[PDB]
Amino acid sequence: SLALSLTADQMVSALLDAEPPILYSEYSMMGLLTNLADRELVHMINWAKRVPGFVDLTSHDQVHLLECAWLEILMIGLVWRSMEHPGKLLFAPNLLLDRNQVEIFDMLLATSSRFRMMNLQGEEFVCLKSIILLNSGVYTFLSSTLKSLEEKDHIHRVLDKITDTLIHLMAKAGLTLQQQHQRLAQLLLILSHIRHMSNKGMEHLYSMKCKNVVPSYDLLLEMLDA
């Protein structure tokens, strides 16, 4: 795969080039956010197709990864957009919501603060978002065929490429070897929090009777082949 030949700088360029635009709300709160997330999803699918290595996978494995990652991806984008607005979640430039408008809100806000405190760079962000896409679903492949084993191996190799890329960016920025490893750890541990927030978000989508809103396997499959 061409993905496994990329330098750190090419991987970053690829991910930066693939970035979706920031969309605006049409501007009911749940109505606006749902409409926005639906439009974001179309772009996420096209973004995913541009993440190096992703289209080397079967369609089935592409969908499984997107099924497992979609809410975490939306969330990390939200946190990134909100970074320079302490106390507020910038769902869109015309939909900026404060804490008063809560437990999920608070978790999202804590994550933005952590990104701010770490001075998270755009190049690091796109790497993290790609890790989420490839990592979130990799441990729940149901098949045990040779093909499935080959697919999981490929994902882990691309994930290794993204690690190397993160370390390269840090070394370029002048971090010592020790600082490089510590910052890599700090970034990857936040992913564990993003998973948690996705899980809480999902359970809250269900709790509001919005089970209709999560993209099915079939929806994603049809969107991928489109």
Which parts of this chain interact with a second copy (CB under 8 A)?
106-107, 109-111, 114, 131, 135-136, 139-140, 142, 156, 159-160, 163-164, 167, 177-178, 180-182, 184-186, 188-193, 195-196, 199-200, 203
Kindly state the tokens that stand for 91.
């769902």
**Distance in angstroms (rounded) separating the CA atoms of residues 195 and 200:** 9
Phi, psi dihedrals of residue 217, rounded to the nearest 5°:
-50, -50
Residue 181 binding partner per list a second copy, ligand 7OI, none, with a CB distance cut-off of 5 to 8 Å that depends on partner kind? a second copy
Kindly state the tokens that stand for 139.
């441990």
Q: Which of 12, 74, 128, 133 binds ligand 7OI (CB under 6 A)?
A: 74
Q: Are strands 95-98 and 88-92 parallel, antiparallel or unpaired?
A: antiparallel
95 closest CA partner among 31, 30, 32 = 32
197 closest CA partner among 119, 112, 90 = 112
Residue 79 within binding range of ligand 7OI, rule CB under 6 A: no
Give me the DSSP letters along 171-224: HHTT--HHHHHHHHHHHHHHHHHHHHHHHHHHHHHHHTT-GGGSPPHHHHHHHH
Residue 199 binding partner per list ligand 7OI, a second copy, none, with a CB distance cut-off of 5 to 8 Å that depends on partner kind? a second copy
Q: Report the nearest approach of ligand 7OI to the CB of residue 30 (Å).
A: 5
Residue 177 binding partner per list ligand 7OI, a second copy, none, with a CB distance cut-off of 5 to 8 Å that depends on partner kind? a second copy
* Binding-site residues for 17beta-estradiol: 40, 81, 204
* Binding-site residues: 40, 81, 204
Residues that bind ligand 7OI (CB under 6 A): 29-30, 33-34, 36-37, 40, 74-75, 77-78, 91, 104-105, 108, 201, 204-205, 213
